[PDB]
């Protein structure tokens, strides 16, 4: 048992917080912003005598994770970066010189912490404030790139930048790209505190760090791999994807499915690195609460070989072939289709899939931007 890397916060401590000296510091963080001893970056900067920590900013789900105003332990003002104020206002920034960002994300575009980062960067740029990212590992590694980039009509808080669905960058590398490619409204005075020892091949468990639930339904490091497996279909609340049960994002089920038939049809696809297992369950809450459901558990037996985000579409395809009168876009809540399109970064994914419920009619669109994005990413990589 050993921590094999130095996170941005560990590097900042080793540098005795030099890049923060003489500045009024604002800190964007949540319960994942901790050092190797699981002490919060809030308490580290508050206790450092050469750091003037003056304000805290909490993203989706909150800062001490207790809201989901002033901080009890430090007495510092706490600002909410969600809903109407997802982007810091000029009034929220008048009391600081630099915004420090320290949050563990999951390497998926629809997870809104990276949206908070980019929009806070843009607010910093527009108000002449410095922005510092304390870099953290990409928990699914720095090699997988999947999905089309976001189209203009589908840019939103759950699809904030023209990057793929799995974008393969650390939050620090993404910040550098947003700045370098003029993807935000104005250039930002950005500094990234680079990690030591992190490698693109590393998944989170290989770093040796503890995983703090990124959000309630991403409780374990392996859960970050499964969020893109089922998360897009999950926006509809049509089938259970395990949210409401004890393996969130790792399964697909409904009351009208025959588990063994669905598993047999999916295993016949021979998707690399995946095995589907039939299952029977009764959700405790959310979708299918207290109903007997049947479906499949998705077991990833080789994380390097598996193409993650396409799995929900193969499941939708095979479920529909078995139960043709249960097609997702024929029976799911129509009021959730716009959200599905936003998370997908285009209405083309739903529209092409809806023609005959076949992934082959969407696959080329899903893969079209990978080679161009990998080439663009090489300009900003910090780690080998």
Residues near K ion, by CB under 5 A: 48, 51
What DSSP element (H or E) covers 254? strand 251-254
The token pair at 105 is 């994300």
Q: Give residues with Cβ within 8 angstroms of 347, minimum separation 6.
A: 153, 154, 341
In the complex, what is the shortest distance from the CB of residue 119 to K ion, in angstroms, rounded to a whole number?
A: 27
Least gap, CB of 25 to K ion (angstroms): 8
- Least distance (Å) from K ion to the CB of residue 70? 16
SS3 240: strand
- Shortest distance, position 171 Cβ to K ion, whole Å: 24
Angle between helices 311-322 and 259-267 (to 10 degrees): 120
CB burial of 169-205 (b: ≥16 within 10 Å; e: otherwise) equals bbbbbbbbbbbeeebbeeebebebbbbeebeeebbbe
Looking at the Cβ atoms of 44 and 271, the one nearer to K ion is 44
CB of 46 to K ion, least distance (A): 5
**45 vs 108, which CB is nearer to K ion?**
45
Which lies closer to K ion via its Cβ, residue 51 or residue 281? 51
Nearest residue (CB) to K ion, 51 versus 296: 51
Give the separation between CA 384 and CA 362, rounded to whole angstroms. 32
- Closest approach, Cβ 130 to K ion, in A, equals 17
Q: Label residue 255 left, alpha or beta by phi (over 0 means left) and psi (-120 to 50 means alpha).
A: alpha
Report, in Å, the least distance between residue 88 CB and K ion. 21
Residue whose CB is less far from K ion, 71 or 181: 71
- Min separation Cβ 31 and K ion, Å: 20
Pairing type for strands 251-254 and 98-102 reads unpaired
**What is the C-alpha to C-alpha distance for residues 351 and 50, in angstroms, rounded to an integer?**
56
Q: Given the complex with K ion, which of 48 and 269 has the nearer CB atom?
A: 48
What is the DSSP secondary-structure string of 8-56? HHHHHHHTTTGGGTTSEEEEEE-TT-B-TT--BHHHHHHH-TT-EEEEE
Measured from the CB atom, the residue of 24 and 199 that comes closer to K ion is 24
Number of neighbouring beta carbons within 10 Å of residue 73: 10
* C-beta nearest to K ion: residue: 51
Residue with smaller CB distance to K ion, 22 or 83: 22
| Location of structure tokens 């920034």 | 93
Cβ atoms of residues 300 and 306 within 8 Å: yes
In whole angstroms, give the CA distance from residue 41 to residue 203.
23
Is the Cβ of residue 23 or residue 347 nearer to K ion in the bound state? 23
**Residue 75 C-beta: closest distance to K ion, Å:** 12
Nearest approach in angstroms of CB 38 to K ion is: 20
CA distances from 313 to 51, 280, 322, 374 (A): 49, 21, 14, 24
* End-to-end Cα distance, the chain: 23
Rank residues 48 and 212 by Cβ distance to K ion and give the closer one: 48
């Amino acid at each position: 048992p050993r921590i094999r890397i130095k996170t941005g916060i560990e590097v900042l401590k080793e540098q005795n917080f030099k890049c923060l000296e003489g500045k009024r510091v604002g800190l964007i963080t949540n319960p994942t912003g901790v050092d190797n001893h699981l002490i919060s970056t809030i308490d580290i900067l508050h206790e450092a005598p050469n750091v003037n920590l003056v304000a805290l900013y909490g993203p989706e789900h909150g800062v001490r994770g207790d809201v989901h105003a002033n901080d009890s332990s430090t007495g510092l003002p706490v600002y909410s970066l969600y809903g109407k104020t997802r982007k810091p206002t000029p009034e929220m920034l008048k009391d600081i010189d630099v915004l420090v960002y320290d949050i563990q994300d999951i390497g998926c575009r629809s997870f809104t912490y990276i949206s908070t980062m980019g929009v806070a960067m843009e607010a910093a740029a527009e108000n002449n404030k410095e922005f510092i990212v304390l870099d953290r590992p990409n928990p699914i590694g720095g090699l997988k790139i999947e999905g089309n980039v976001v189209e203009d009509g589908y840019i939103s808080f759950v699809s904030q930048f023209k990057i793929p669905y799995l974008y393969g960058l650390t939050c620090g590398e993404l910040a550098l790209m947003l700045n370098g490619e003029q993807m935000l409204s104005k250039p930002c005075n950005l500094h990234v505190v680079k990690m030591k020892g992190w490698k693109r091949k590393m998944d989170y468990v290989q770093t040796g760090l503890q995983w703090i639930p990124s959000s309630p339904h991403i409780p374990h490091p392996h859960s970050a791999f499964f969020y893109p497996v089922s998360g897009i279909l999950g926006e509809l609340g049509y089938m259970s994807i395990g949210v409401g049960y004890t393996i969130p994002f790792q399964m697909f089920a409904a009351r009208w499915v025959e588990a063994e038939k669905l598993a047999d049809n999916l295993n016949r696809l021979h998707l690399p690195g995946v095995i589907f297992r039939p299952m029977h369950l009764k959700p405790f809450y959310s979708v299918g609460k207290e109903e007997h459901l049947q479906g499949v558990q998705v077991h990833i037996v080789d994380f390097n070989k598996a193409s993650l985000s396409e799995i929900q579409f193969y499941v939708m395809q095979e479920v529909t072939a078995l139960y043709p009168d249960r097609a997702v876009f024929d029976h799911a809540d129509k009021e959730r289709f716009h959200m599905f399109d936003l998370v997908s970064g285009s209405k083309e994914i739903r529209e092409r899939f809806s023609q005959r419920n076949r992934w082959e009619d969407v696959r080329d669109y899903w893969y079209k931007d990978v080679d161009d994005f990998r080439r663009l990413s090489q300009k900003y990589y910090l780690y080998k």
